[PDB]
RNA sequence: UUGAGAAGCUCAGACGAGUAGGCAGGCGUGGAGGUUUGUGACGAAGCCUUGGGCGUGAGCCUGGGUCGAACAGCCUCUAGU
RNA sequence: CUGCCGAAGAGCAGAAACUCAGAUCAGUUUUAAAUGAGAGUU
RNA sequence: UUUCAAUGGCCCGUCCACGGACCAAGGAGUCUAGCAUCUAUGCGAGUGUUUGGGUGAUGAAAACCCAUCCGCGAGGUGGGAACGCCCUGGCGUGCACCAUC
RNA sequence: GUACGUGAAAUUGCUGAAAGCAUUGGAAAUCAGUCUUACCUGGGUGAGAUCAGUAGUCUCUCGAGACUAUGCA
């Protein structure tokens, strides 16, 4: 924790260094897609692989 | 599905027969006056994408299976769930000690081996 | 005594809700098509 | 997963809550030689799974 | 950098693209189609936006509910030429370290585009701003 | 207790739960940040729960821990749970949401059961109003947009089911649905407002205060 | 792993140094283990071979053979042992040489210098 | 219904000459890092072969003969390719 | 190696960006609208 | 595979001419400095450790760290993406960008 | 076998057979791989184990594996 610091607090053994910030917050995207937040407003899905 | 091949002949290089210095691997004819590149009559064919085989039966040996090169016993155990879909092939550099162990294991697994009679003898 | 997962209970409510309307637009669609065929 | 060991088949299960303990990551159960019971065992141990 | 996918090799931007591919096609929202399109854009096509711009753009008529989250598919940089930062709520690809500290300490909160999606999956009450492409 | 509740050994975690009953049963005022720290330990006690049989006995144990708490800070205990669950809900992964869904279901019923218990000592409407006020500056707060809507859809789904379970025979007249009505009437997130009525199973039979 | 930049790990230099080693250096390169008893009574693991040492061949086609080292052929790093020879086509017994590491010394030819070497190299005569 | 290498799977329709020139994806060689619980004196590599197989192709796999000490797949790096 | 696009003999060919059936066009024809095509731009 | 049959089949490259007896091996857009665009990456009103100093007990030409400099940088109208509220459309907000005062 | 590791092609001799670029097939020569032993069902005889209205040990976390006895319903 002194070598690398935090994303908000600095490293002690590196000058002015903060751990990189991430583009996403929760990297589990299947958790985002299949959540009650998003699955409650999506339009009802058509078939998977469809018949001919 | 049956294993349909659109073509069975190799696409020999132009004038590979005329010269021993000219190999038989295909090279597109870069020439600008080349009659054969011009696809005259009787000129030998050139690799086109239309000869490409069916995506469902690509890579399939005449018996409907696909070759899966195998170097030891651990490899033949991967084909446990694909024995109707794949055939084991022992590499040429696998010794006759391992070849026997590969073949015996694969026999219980119900896996076809394309070269199971190699480097070995029978005693019965 | 393993209770069914909560997310599974939520999906069933949506699947049931979707199945209600698909069944609802079955007898009407059959009738409307049938009358369309006579027309 | 199902894998063989000494002529006996086992069901191996891992959950996310033991992800950081490789030694205790997989639990193992012994499946019956009875095929129907072994199928019942997989249903019973893997219920509400996908 | 193109129309079909991003040219970035960053996995987390691909994960964002994987999420907004879903919204783009399983919702009627035009907000989720725009976000997916702007996620395929290059660095120069996603010019940075500033804190001062965001406060200035969302002002004057700020007597409204102002629950509107500001969304940029880009970086929210800092503008130290302004002294007091209002209460803002911004969802961006990136915040610089001083931009994120100012929005938090004097004001509201900073989001990611996946945190927005769980808040406004249809982009409702959002101000989808853009940076100037003047180079 | 806090470090022990999040141990890597279930035996160590469990021994901190049994010792937590004495700590919570104290007749002294607990500061809000003290319950914030405790619930971070308790969150990881359930975050690390392994089997569904265990992780559902644990939810019963944690919900059964509410009546142990002192009456004066019993509301603080539950309000801190719903605040420690709102901020940490987004970071939960897809394979852990179903054990916390049951945890909120067990804590929703604990709230209704605590109202039932206190309805004997004092009039019901004061108890409900005090609990409703807890919901107002908690999950059903309109001023904050950080609270997840996945929890609020859960509470709407289970609100009447847990109410019926607490009073099998018949529930009295009270403002059971006040947090939801005031939310849909003033929520700043349209997705919540537009779909909360579609999920809530509000019955008009018992809602007239 | 070597840590000294005085010693080389270059194969080209090690091979050149081995084969272009002088006869004094080759004297140490041809060293044989002592038998268990000599190893456990002289407290020395291994000594350079000498003429008139009683050895046993340990490896090769002549395994198990014994004899005295008639001479040391230091140019080819080979030992020559009594009666360990090969018959030629004409009937001559041309000796065959063995590597000094492939034999074991079972009786040392103890000069005064060896005894001084023994005591110097942690030994007890 | 199990058919998420979501970079996957699936439905449909149209289209197909090509020099300069542009774009994309692949095959191969020497060396580098990682990897295959990799191959090897029960024979590595190479070479020979009217033996067999795969790929539209660049090419790859293999049987037999010869041989006798090293070699390769996969992910990146590099170039006197 | 295969594929795709593809001339000329400022114009002709693409790429990004925008603005788009609620748009303009056309190696066309009638009259003094018909028909085909989504059209453009820096 | 060889051969036969029927059918087709005019030597290749190069620019008539020029190269070609055959085979193997070697054999030609390379490295480096400058500039411009495009893409990716990190940070972002900043940015760039590697002139040098610190340091490195397993190889120490690496990796790690960094003082002082220094470079380069430093208001309305209409249309309009997106959004909210309504009873296709209307109303409000209106990024980027383009004509406008 | 020192004209010595491997030993390619061009090239030369001898022997054997045939004859006097592509398409498609014939003749001749050659070659690839090709299955039978299993499935179900019934009974008899014994076997054991994941069985015992059964006793113990070790490692993990009540029961989960590994065992050692004892029985063969």
Cα angle for residues F85, F89, F95 (degrees, 5° grid): 125
Listed as ranges, the nucleotides of chain H within 7 A of a protein C-beta are 1-4, 6-7, 9-12, 16, 19, 37-45, 53-59, 61-64, 71
Residue B111 lies in a domain: yes
Which uninterrupted H or E stretch holds E110?
Answer: strand E109-111
How far are the Cα atoms of C31, E7, F1, F54, F60 from residue F40, in angstroms, in the given order?
60, 40, 11, 20, 18
Written as one string, the DSSP assignment of B52-70 is PPPTTTTTB-TTS-EEEEE
Angle between helices F124-136 and F97-121 (to 10 degrees): 150
**Residue G94, beta-bridge partner list:** G86
In this structure, how many other beta carbons lie within 10 angstroms of the beta carbon of residue B79? 19
Q: Does the distance separating the beta carbons of F53 and C7 come in below 8 Å?
A: no
User: Structure tokens of B73?
Assistant: 């016993």
Q: Looking up tokens 């109707």, which residue turns up?
A: B84
| Cβ-contact B35, B43 below 8 angstroms | yes
Q: How far is the CA of A49 from the C1' of K3 (A)?
A: 75
Count the domains in chain G.
1
CA-to-CA distance for F139 and F107, rounded, in angstroms?
A: 13
**Residue E111, beta-bridge partner list:** E91
CA-to-CA distance for G33 and G53, rounded, in angstroms?
A: 12
Count the domains in chain B.
1
Q: Which pairs with CB-CB distance under 8 Å and at least 24 residues apart come from D3-10?
A: D9/D38
Angle between helices F32-47 and F97-121 (to 10 degrees): 130
Please tell me whether residue A7 adopts helix, strand or coil conformation.
coil
Which uninterrupted H or E stretch holds E94?
Answer: strand E89-95
F91 touching A, CB under 8 A? yes
Angle between helices F74-88 and F32-47 (to 10 degrees): 60
Q: How far is the CA of E110 from the C1' of H80 (A)?
A: 55
Cα angle for residues B113, B114, B118 (degrees, 5° grid): 95
CA-to-CA distance for E115 and E96, rounded, in angstroms?
A: 18
CA-to-CA distance for F129 and F178, rounded, in angstroms?
A: 9
Q: Does the distance separating the beta carbons of A36 and C14 come in below 8 Å?
A: no
In this structure, how many other beta carbons lie within 10 angstroms of the beta carbon of residue E113? 22
Residue B123 lies in a domain: no
Q: Is the CB of B98 under 7 A from strand H?
A: yes
CA-to-CA distance for E91 and E113, rounded, in angstroms?
A: 6
CA-to-CA distance for C16 and C23, rounded, in angstroms?
A: 10
CA-to-CA distance for F153 and C11, rounded, in angstroms?
A: 13
Helical segments of chain E, H only? 11-26, 30-39, 51-57, 97-105, 113-119
| Residue E124 burial (10 A CB sphere; 0-12, 13-18, 19+) | buried
Phi, psi (rounded to 5 degrees) for B113: -115, 125
Residue G7: CA atoms inside 13 Å, Cβ hemisphere, count?
5
User: Structure tokens of C39?
Assistant: 């027309």
| Cβ-contact F76, F129 below 8 angstroms | no
Listed as ranges, the nucleotides of chain K within 7 A of a protein C-beta are 9-11, 21-24, 33, 48, 50, 60-61, 64-67
Rg (CA), chain F: 17
User: Structure tokens of G19?
Assistant: 């084969």
A37 touching C, CB under 8 A? no
Please tell me whether residue B11 adopts helix, strand or coil conformation.
coil
Map chain G to HEC letters: CCCCCCCCCCHHHHHHHHHCCCHHHHHHHCEEEECHHHHHHCCCCEEECCCCCEEEECCCCCCCCEEEEEEEEHHHCEEEECCCEEECCCCCEEECCECHHHEEEEECCCCHHHHHHHHHCCCCC
Q: List, in order, residues 6 or more apart from F17 with CB less than 8 Å away.
A: F5, F45, F61
| Cβ-contact G29, G21 below 8 angstroms | yes
Please tell me whether residue E120 adopts helix, strand or coil conformation.
coil
CA-to-CA distance for F61 and F85, rounded, in angstroms?
A: 17
How far are the Cα atoms of E2, F208, G54, G104 from residue G107, in angstroms, in the given order?
85, 114, 5, 9
Residue E128: CA atoms inside 13 Å, Cβ hemisphere, count?
17
CA-to-CA distance for D25 and F137, rounded, in angstroms?
A: 41
Measured on CA atoms in the order F147, F153, F158, F159, is the torsion positive or negative? positive
E-to-F residue pairs, Cβ atoms closer than 8 angstroms? 25
**Residue B68, beta-bridge partner list:** B88
User: Structure tokens of A47?
Assistant: 């078939």
Sheet holding G78-81, edge to edge: G78-81, G66-73, G54-57, G103-107
Residue B9: CA atoms inside 13 Å, Cβ hemisphere, count?
8
Residue B34 lies in a domain: yes
| Cβ-contact B42, B57 below 8 angstroms | no
In this structure, how many other beta carbons lie within 10 angstroms of the beta carbon of residue B23? 11
Smallest CA–CA distance, residue C17 to chain D, in Å, is 21
Please tell me whether residue F24 adopts helix, strand or coil conformation.
helix
**Residue E99, beta-bridge partner list:** none
In this structure, how many other beta carbons lie within 10 angstroms of the beta carbon of residue E132? 10
Angle between helices F74-88 and F124-136 (to 10 degrees): 30
Q: Mutate one of F90, F145, F189, F199 to test the A interface: name it (highest A CB count within 10 A).
A: F90
Chains in contact with chain D (at least 3 beta-carbon pairs closer than 8 A):
C, F
| Cβ-contact E11, E38 below 8 angstroms | no
Rg (CA), chain A: 21
Of G27, G15, G17, nearest to G75 by C-alpha is: G27
Pairing type for strands G31-33 and E126-128 reads unpaired
Residue B105 lies in a domain: yes
Phi, psi (rounded to 5 degrees) for D12: -105, 125
CA-to-CA distance for D48 and A30, rounded, in angstroms?
A: 18
Residues shown for chain D: 50
Measured on CA atoms in the order F43, F48, F49, F51, is the torsion positive or negative? positive
Residue F34: CA atoms inside 13 Å, Cβ hemisphere, count?
10
Q: Is the CB of B90 under 7 A from strand H?
A: yes
User: Structure tokens of E68?
Assistant: 């509107």
| Cβ-contact D24, D18 below 8 angstroms | yes
Residues within 8 A of F (CB atoms), E 46-75 only: 65, 67, 69
In this structure, how many other beta carbons lie within 10 angstroms of the beta carbon of residue G100? 22
How far are the Cα atoms of F21, F23, F135 from residue F117, in angstroms, in the given order?
19, 22, 18
CA-to-CA distance for D9 and E37, rounded, in angstroms?
A: 51
Q: Looking at beta carbons, which residues of chain E come within 8 Å of F191?
A: 120-122, 124
| Cβ-contact F134, F107 below 8 angstroms | no
Phi, psi (rounded to 5 degrees) for F138: -125, -125
Q: What is the DSSP letter of B113?
A: B
User: Structure tokens of B10?
Assistant: 């190799």
CA-to-CA distance for F50 and F54, rounded, in angstroms?
A: 7
CA-to-CA distance for E34 and E123, rounded, in angstroms?
A: 10
Which residues form the domain of B91? 1-118
Listed as ranges, the nucleotides of chain I within 7 A of a protein C-beta are 1-4, 15-17
Which residues form the domain of G78? 1-125
CA-to-CA distance for E85 and E88, rounded, in angstroms?
A: 8
Cα angle for residues G85, G89, G95 (degrees, 5° grid): 15
Pairing type for strands G46-48 and G31-33 reads antiparallel
In angstroms, this model's resolution equals 3.8
CA-to-CA distance for E111 and E127, rounded, in angstroms?
A: 14
Phi, psi (rounded to 5 degrees) for B88: -75, 145
Residue B124 lies in a domain: no
CA-to-CA distance for G105 and A25, rounded, in angstroms?
A: 74
Residue B29 lies in a domain: yes
**Residue E107, beta-bridge partner list:** none
| Cβ-contact F14, F61 below 8 angstroms | no
Please tell me whether residue D14 adopts helix, strand or coil conformation.
strand
Q: Is the CB of B49 under 7 A from strand H?
A: yes
Of E55, E48, E105, E50, nearest to E73 by C-alpha is: E48
CA distance between the termini of chain E: 17
Strand runs (DSSP E) across D1-50, as ranges? 2-5, 8-14, 26-30
| Cβ-contact E6, E40 below 8 angstroms | yes
Phi, psi (rounded to 5 degrees) for E111: -120, 175
Chains in contact with chain E (at least 3 beta-carbon pairs closer than 8 A):
A, F
Q: Looking at beta carbons, which residues of chain F come within 8 Å of E65?
A: 188
Q: Looking at beta carbons, which residues of chain E come within 8 Å of F150?
A: 118
Buried b (16+ CB within 10 A) or exposed e, F90-123: bebebebbbbbbbbbbbbbbbbbbbbbebbeeee
Please tell me whether residue B105 adopts helix, strand or coil conformation.
helix
């Amino acid at each position: 924790d002194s070598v690398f610091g935090s994303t908000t607090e600095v490293a002690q053994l590196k000058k002015n260094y903060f751990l990189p910030e991430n583009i996403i917050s929760n990297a589990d995207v299947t958790r985002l897609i299949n959540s009650d937040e998003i699955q409650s407003i999506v339009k009802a899905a058509g078939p998977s692989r469809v018949k001919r | 599905v049956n294993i349909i091949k659109k073509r069975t002949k190799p696409f020999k290089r132009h004038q590979s027969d005329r010269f021993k210095r000219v190999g038989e691997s295909w090279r597109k004819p870069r020439g600008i006056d080349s009659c054969v590149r011009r696809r005259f009559r009787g000129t030998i064919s050139m690799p086109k994408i239309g000869y490409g085989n069916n995506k469902k039966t690509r890579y399939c040996m005449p018996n409907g299976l696909k070759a899966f090169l195998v170097r030891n016993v651990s490899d033949v155990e991967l084909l446990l769930m694909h024995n109707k879909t794949y055939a084991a092939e022992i590499a040429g550099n696998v010794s006759a000690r391992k070849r026997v162990e590969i073949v015996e294991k694969a026999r219980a697994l119900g896996v076809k081996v394309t070269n199971a009679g190699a480097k070995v003898r029978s005693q019965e | 005594s393993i209770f069914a997962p909560e997310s599974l209970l939520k999906k069933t409510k949506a699947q049931k809700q979707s199945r209600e309307q698909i069944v609802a637009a079955a007898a009407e669609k059959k009738s409307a098509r049938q009358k369309k065929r006579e027309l | 997963t199902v894998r063989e060991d000494n002529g006996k088949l086992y069901l191996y299960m891992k959950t996310i809550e033991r992800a950081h303990f490789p030694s205790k990551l997989w639990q193992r159960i012994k499946l019956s030689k009875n095929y129907a019971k072994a199928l019942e065992q997989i249903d019973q141990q893997l219920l509400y799974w996908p | 950098s193109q129309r079909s996918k991003p040219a970035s090799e960053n996995v987390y931007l691909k994960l964002l693209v994987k999420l907004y591919r879903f919204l783009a096609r399983r919702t009627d929202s035009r907000f989720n189609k725009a976000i997916l399109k702007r996620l395929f854009q290059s660095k120069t096509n996603r010019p940075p936006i500033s804190i001062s711009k965001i406060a200035a753009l969302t002002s004057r008529k700020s007597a409204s509910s102002q629950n509107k989250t500001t969304v940029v598919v880009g970086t929210v940089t800092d503008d130290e030429r302004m002294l007091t930062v209002p209460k803002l709520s911004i969802a961006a690809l990136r915040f610089t370290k001083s931009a994120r500290a100012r929005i938090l300490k004097a004001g509201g909160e900073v989001l990611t585009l996946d945190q927005l999606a769980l808040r406004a999956p249809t982009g409702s009450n959002t101000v989808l701003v853009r940076g100037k492409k003047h180079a | 207790f806090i470090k022990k509740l999040a141990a890597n050994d279930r035996k160590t975690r469990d021994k901190a739960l049994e010792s937590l009953q004495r700590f919570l049963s104290q007749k002294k005022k607990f500061e809000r940040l003290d319950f914030l720290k405790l619930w971070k330990g308790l969150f990881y006690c359930m975050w690390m729960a392994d089997k569904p049989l265990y992780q559902q006995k644990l939810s019963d144990n944690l919900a059964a821990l509410v009546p142990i708490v002192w009456i004066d800070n019993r509301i603080l205990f539950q309000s801190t749970f719903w605040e420690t669950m709102g901020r940490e809900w987004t970071g939960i992964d897809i394979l852990r949401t179903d054990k916390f869904y049951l945890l909120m279901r067990r804590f929703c019923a604990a709230a209704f059961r605590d109202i039932q218990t206190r309805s004997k000592t004092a009039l019901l409407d004061k108890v409900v109003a005090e609990y409703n006020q807890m919901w107002m500056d908690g999950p059903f707060n309109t001023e904050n947009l950080a609270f997840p809507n996945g929890i609020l859809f859960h509470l709407a789904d289970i609100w009447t089911e847990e109410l019926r379970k607490v009073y099998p025979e018949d529930v009295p007249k009270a403002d059971w649905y006040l947090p939801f009505d005031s939310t849909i009437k003033s929520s700043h997130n349209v997705v919540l407002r537009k779909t909360l009525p579609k999920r809530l199973d509000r019955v008009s039979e018992y809602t007239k205060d | 792993m070597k840590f000294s930049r005085d010693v080389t790990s270059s194969r080209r230099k090690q091979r050149k140094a081995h084969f272009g080693a002088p006869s004094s250096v080759r004297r140490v390169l041809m060293s044989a283990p002592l038998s268990k008893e000599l190893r456990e009574q002289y407290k020395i693991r291994s000594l350079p071979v000498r003429r008139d040492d009683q050895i046993t061949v340990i490896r090769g086609s002549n395994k198990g053979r014994e004899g005295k080292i008639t001479s040391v052929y230091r140019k080819k790093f080979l030992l020559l042992i009594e009666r360990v020879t090969r018959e030629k086509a004409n009937g001559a017994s041309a000796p065959v040489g063995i590597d000094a590491s492939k034999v074991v010394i079972t009786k040392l030819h103890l000069d005064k210098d060896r005894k001084d070497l023994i005591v110097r190299k942690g030994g007890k005569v």
